[PDB]
């Protein structure tokens, strides 16, 4: 009932469309837990671009 597109998320969906659906903090777009996104999480992608 409270997905990204309700929270005015604009960049987040474009990262989810191509694979990146997890965070280093543990949560995930699909709503799963215990998953290991590796480096390429939302933080990772954001990190990369800044560099």
Partner 1 sequence: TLTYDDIVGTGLANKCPTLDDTARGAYPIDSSQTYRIARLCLQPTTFLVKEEPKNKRQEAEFVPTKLVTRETTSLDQIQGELKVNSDGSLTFVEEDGIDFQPVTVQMAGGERIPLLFTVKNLVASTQPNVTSITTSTDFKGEFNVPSYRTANFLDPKGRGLASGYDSAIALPQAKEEELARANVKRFSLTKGQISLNVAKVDGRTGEIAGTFESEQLSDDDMGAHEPHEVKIQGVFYASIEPA
Partner 2 sequence: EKLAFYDYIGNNPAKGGLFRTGPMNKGDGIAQAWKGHAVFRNKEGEELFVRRMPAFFESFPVILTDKNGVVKADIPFRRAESKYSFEQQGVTVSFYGGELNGQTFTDPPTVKSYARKAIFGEIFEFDTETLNSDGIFRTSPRGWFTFAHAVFA
Residues that bind partner 2 (CB under 8 A): 1-2, 4-10, 13
Residue owning tokens 């929270």: 7
Helix (H, G, I), strand (E, B) or coil at 31: coil
The region of 3-11, 16-24, 26-34, 38-46 touching ligand CLA under the rule CB under 6 A is: 3-11
Over the Cα atoms of the chain, what is R_g? 11
DSSP 32: -
- What is the distance between the alpha carbons of residues 24 and 28, in angstroms, rounded to a whole number? 9
Binds ligand CLA (CB under 6 A): choice among 8, 17, 50, 51: 8
The region of 7-15, 17-25, 26-34, 35-43 touching ligand CLA under the rule CB under 6 A is: 7-15
Positions that interact with ligand CLA (CB under 6 A) = 7-8, 10
């Amino acid at each position: 009932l409270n997905p990204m597109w309700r929270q005015g998320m604009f960049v987040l969906p474009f990262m989810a469309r191509l694979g990146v659906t997890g965070s280093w903090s543990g949560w995930s777009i699909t709503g799963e837990t215990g998953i290991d996104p590796g480096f390429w999480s939302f933080e990772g992608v954001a990190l990369a671009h800044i560099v």
